[PDB]
Write a sequence for this structure.
């Protein structure tokens, strides 16, 4: 039916997405490491829609494959997938960074999204016309700045991956979108999680024949600084 | 007030946008080369909203500038500008092309856009918060293909100008968006009404949000990769 | 024969390129609006190599078309074209710019390069294997910043036009390169001689190779990231 | 101070680079999984320069770090690093790919690159003015195509990481270049590994004040096909 899988559903924009699509009565599968926060959200949203909470680390390939294999028949076809699970770690310039932080970002922001995408593609294919993948990219995937190193690289991966995935999805009906948000809260009036939630709702309800390849959104307060000279 | 200026309002996605924003009751200035067709649309939409048809070619700096000065006072402030006037003049190999055609495209797709945006900018700035410029770019602005030459060049101009313009508009509230459509009308291509819907959504964005760019293809359209000769 | 056409040979990186290719013994066609300055450079380099100075404005399609039609037989084939004529006219905010300035920039930076390329292309094609077009782009074609508006726009045109041109030139042997310099003449900025050297290397690439784009900045120059207005 | 560390050295652009720099007499650290092929190459080049072959998988973080900390005092400063280790594992549609291959490409092309660059970065900074890092990206990092999926994402990661790195290295003198090759030999007259080696040599021998941000190079026989409509 209208079924949606959201990774990191207590992380970043995941909760706001969960709330927005619950308001619309989509069936939800919500992924989260924090079992207690996830489960409370599921319980709350359970009053307006069907929710299946899965306590799960997207880095964990085996657990993710087990979770997907064990999905109820309700989800034999999947309408939506939001790849939201991701994080930025550290402050240091690249040369004094902790490789532990770099591993975690790569495993989460890239491998996590690859696992959730590959494992769920057959169900997205099976839905067909109107199916939608929304990947959480970032302005950091395009525009370099100090300290961005791996986080930006990670988001640049996501951007190209989305475009590339569309080249493999011929005749399938499945859409793919890279949403690239700028400065969030989540007097500058930053993007709010509910703004991301509304935008993804709009993206996923696009007429079956249309694919938004990419959409870069910033607060109007945010623009580009140009170059630094040392 | 909700006021909208549209270049090439008879030409591309211009009519669809005119119709779509009339439904929402925005007051419309519509420009076009084809006077009879421009006036028939204005006459038709005048039943739903205020419309001002302006017969002009966006390439003509003096005519555009005169027309802007002569706008009625309801437009002392301007909410939206859709820079939609633009054309492609074939996909011949560059080495065989006619420089007149290349002239027409530069003057229309770049200069026409520049004139409309600069002349109207102070009115958009006067409106402030909530104001939006939508430039019509194209997928041709970033993806090379045989025969793209000048059309694609002009659309990459539009893309970069859009982003650049935002760096100049700090503190004004004015928003700038580059909309980049792919294949339009078994492909189920993009319909003009889809672009009209998309622009309405961009222009109605909450004041604090700026959609920098939005690339849209029909789902049937993807990338072919590389050619080897 | 090693024949080279250089637009704006007394502007920007143009003189440095004429000198560099002069010492390598290529025959030069050099354009410039200022006749005396152009002929002095032509006179001087005449001791090292054959030089044809043409006094013309690249915006002038008719002048440009007549000059190319009147090229001596030495130039029945063209090895190299450097599209170097171009200028900026401020970093004044867009809303307050002079449309005269903006007109001048697109006529020069865009149409000038268009007329150049189109009128000479049959001669470059007649040369065939090893022929080279080098367009002067800029970091401005890619990275947005305050007051860049039209100049960056023009340089983005140049970038896309370069790549696009390649798609029409199959079977011809002709190469096209977009060179994108940053800060030029503490900071140790790019020197005109650095550009001459890099264009020399580009035009002498083995015939089977095409450098699509090459972005060069002084090492003192990087990216500042975003600006937020409060 | 003229030392070079090359990852994936035994057969690729890798071997070509080792051989090219050996002619110039740079002192070589060569990294490779294939011990015997690696040792034979070091033995051959020991006639021309100092070589140190290190048997290693760039994916293995503990081994890379143990290898780096165990380098002779000769490499207390490091002049150049070529991050060349990387692989594609086929062109099948994403929905039918094996996640093992995706792990392998992310671990090698991203993580491997990140380990060698973080671990050696303090040695590159110690050298300072004139030091160069050359990452091997690809046309795939920028241009989508069927079956590109993870490989292209991986190369988009490399490009953005390259540019981001420059923002962290202000004041050090260290240069970072993303090189983006197209169709290679591994009647189209494709890029030969010796061409890659030639271009990296030109990059690394650049005047100290200059940074080549990126250089995309295709065989002239290669261009863009545009769009597919299903």
């Amino acid at each position: 039916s209208s079924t949606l899988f959201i990774t990191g559903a207590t992380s970043g924009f995941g909760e706001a997405c969960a709330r927005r699509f619950a308001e619309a009565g989509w069936s939800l599968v919500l992924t989260g490491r924090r079992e207690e926060r996830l489960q409370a959200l599921a319980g709350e949203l359970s009053a307006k829609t069907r929710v299946l909470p899965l306590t799960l680390d997207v880095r964990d390939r085996a657990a993710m494959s087990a979770a997907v294999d064990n999905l109820p028949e309700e989800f034999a076809t999947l309408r939506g997938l939001i790849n939201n699970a991701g994080l930025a770690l550290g402050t240091d310039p690249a040369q004094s960074c902790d490789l532990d932080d770099w591993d975690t970002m790569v495993d989460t922001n890239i491998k996590g999204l690859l696992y959730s995408t590959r494992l769920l593609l057959p169900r997205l294919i099976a839905h067909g016309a109107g199916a939608s993948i929304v990947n959480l990219g970032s302005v950091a995937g395009k525009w370099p700045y100090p300290g961005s190193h791996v986080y930006g690289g990670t988001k640049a991966f996501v951007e190209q991956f989305s475009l590339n995935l569309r080249c493999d999805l011929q005749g399938t009906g499945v859409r793919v979108t890279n949403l690239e948000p700028g400065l969030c809260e989540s007097g500058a009036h930053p993007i709010q999680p509910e703004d991301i939630a509304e935008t993804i709702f709009w993206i996923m309800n696009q007429p079956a024949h249309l694919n938004i390849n990419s959409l870069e959104i910033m607060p109007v307060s945010q623009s580009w600084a140009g170059f630094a000279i040392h």
